[PDB]
Enzyme design. Sequence first.
Site, PDB file in Angstrom:
ATOM      1  N   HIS A 191       4.993  -1.017  -1.342  1.00  0.00           N
ATOM      2  CA  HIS A 191       4.164  -0.870  -0.168  1.00  0.00           C
ATOM      3  C   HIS A 191       4.718   0.311   0.606  1.00  0.00           C
ATOM      4  O   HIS A 191       5.937   0.454   0.682  1.00  0.00           O
ATOM      5  CB  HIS A 191       4.218  -2.126   0.709  1.00  0.00           C
ATOM      6  CG  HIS A 191       3.896  -3.383  -0.026  1.00  0.00           C
ATOM      7  ND1 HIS A 191       2.643  -3.959   0.000  1.00  0.00           N
ATOM      8  CD2 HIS A 191       4.646  -4.144  -0.851  1.00  0.00           C
ATOM      9  CE1 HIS A 191       2.641  -5.037  -0.766  1.00  0.00           C
ATOM     10  NE2 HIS A 191       3.846  -5.178  -1.292  1.00  0.00           N
ATOM     11  N   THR A 237       2.475 -11.528  -0.227  1.00  0.00           N
ATOM     12  CA  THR A 237       2.030 -10.774   0.954  1.00  0.00           C
ATOM     13  C   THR A 237       0.649 -10.155   0.791  1.00  0.00           C
ATOM     14  O   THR A 237       0.160  -9.475   1.693  1.00  0.00           O
ATOM     15  CB  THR A 237       3.005  -9.652   1.309  1.00  0.00           C
ATOM     16  OG1 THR A 237       2.956  -8.647   0.283  1.00  0.00           O
ATOM     17  CG2 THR A 237       4.445 -10.204   1.465  1.00  0.00           C
ATOM     18  N   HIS A 284      -4.897  -1.584  -4.686  1.00  0.00           N
ATOM     19  CA  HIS A 284      -4.090  -1.835  -3.465  1.00  0.00           C
ATOM     20  C   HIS A 284      -2.644  -1.373  -3.560  1.00  0.00           C
ATOM     21  O   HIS A 284      -1.993  -1.188  -2.539  1.00  0.00           O
ATOM     22  CB  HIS A 284      -4.160  -3.277  -2.936  1.00  0.00           C
ATOM     23  CG  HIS A 284      -3.913  -4.340  -3.951  1.00  0.00           C
ATOM     24  ND1 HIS A 284      -2.683  -4.942  -4.125  1.00  0.00           N
ATOM     25  CD2 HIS A 284      -4.765  -4.979  -4.793  1.00  0.00           C
ATOM     26  CE1 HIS A 284      -2.780  -5.880  -5.051  1.00  0.00           C
ATOM     27  NE2 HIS A 284      -4.029  -5.914  -5.481  1.00  0.00           N
ATOM     28  N   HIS A 332       8.963  -4.340  -4.369  1.00  0.00           N
ATOM     29  CA  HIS A 332       8.941  -5.744  -4.754  1.00  0.00           C
ATOM     30  C   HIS A 332       9.007  -5.900  -6.253  1.00  0.00           C
ATOM     31  O   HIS A 332       8.116  -5.461  -6.963  1.00  0.00           O
ATOM     32  CB  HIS A 332       7.650  -6.363  -4.240  1.00  0.00           C
ATOM     33  CG  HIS A 332       7.619  -6.487  -2.761  1.00  0.00           C
ATOM     34  ND1 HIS A 332       6.461  -6.698  -2.051  1.00  0.00           N
ATOM     35  CD2 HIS A 332       8.619  -6.432  -1.855  1.00  0.00           C
ATOM     36  CE1 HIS A 332       6.749  -6.758  -0.769  1.00  0.00           C
ATOM     37  NE2 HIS A 332       8.052  -6.600  -0.625  1.00  0.00           N
TER      38      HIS A 332
END
Length: 257
Positions: free
Chosen positions: A93, A195, A61, A116
């Site tokens: 992301h 998240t 991911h 992050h």
Amino acid sequence: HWGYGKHNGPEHWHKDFPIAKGERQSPVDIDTHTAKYDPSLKPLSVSYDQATSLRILNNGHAFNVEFDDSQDKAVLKGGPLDGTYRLIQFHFHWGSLDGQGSEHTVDKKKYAAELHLVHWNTKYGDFGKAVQQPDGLAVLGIFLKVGSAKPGLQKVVDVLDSIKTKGKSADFTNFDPRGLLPESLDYWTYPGSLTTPPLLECVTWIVLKEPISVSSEQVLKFRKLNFNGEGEPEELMVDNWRPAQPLKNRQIKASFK
Ligand SMILES: CC(=O)Nc1nnc(S(N)(=O)=O)s1
Ligand SMILES: [Zn+2]
């Protein structure tokens, strides 16, 4: 299993992780006019001089750059925090297009990507225990806009070819995360969540006001990664962001006027 597709993306997550509809979910839109300056907020203390990076992992991911968190080496303190939080990993992301990719937004504006830096509160002893606590994590969020290259990002970009697919990892020692920070440490802060699933409500979010600039080629290379494993049909790792969630009964505080 969950992901970012039409059939398993953010709108589906609540079925396996009901906390997705909770009271302190992240990310959120930061309405700068409604965020109040809090003169009692302390400066952030980022102590990364002794950071020990170990490895970079495509987890299906995103990619995580992992650190040695078995001792106080790279730590975040101050700001809104009480206590010492150890850096365990950073990841990003990003979007399929330069106009989207960030999770937090600022007055509804989307950045091309968001970094992050994930830290856990040492009073809980390990990360797995920390994520079960409302003050267990502190995540430093940094926006990326497309413009000039970020020199300190290039070693990350360079290694992505070697971790193209899910489950691939590579040595990534001697990386200095200080090279990913903007000049200013002015920030917004609010209580929120992971998240990604399991979406645990354990994070003090600290989001820097100043974005870093990265080049179009740097983010292009992020977009060549794959969500899939080797030998599986190719699915480009893009748009691995959760949209803004309801703010509910929360206030965002600013460390600056
Ligand atoms: C081990 C670990 O870091 N898990 C995380 N899950 N979601 C995170 S995020 N996007 O809120 O920083 S970090
Ligand atoms: Zn994240």
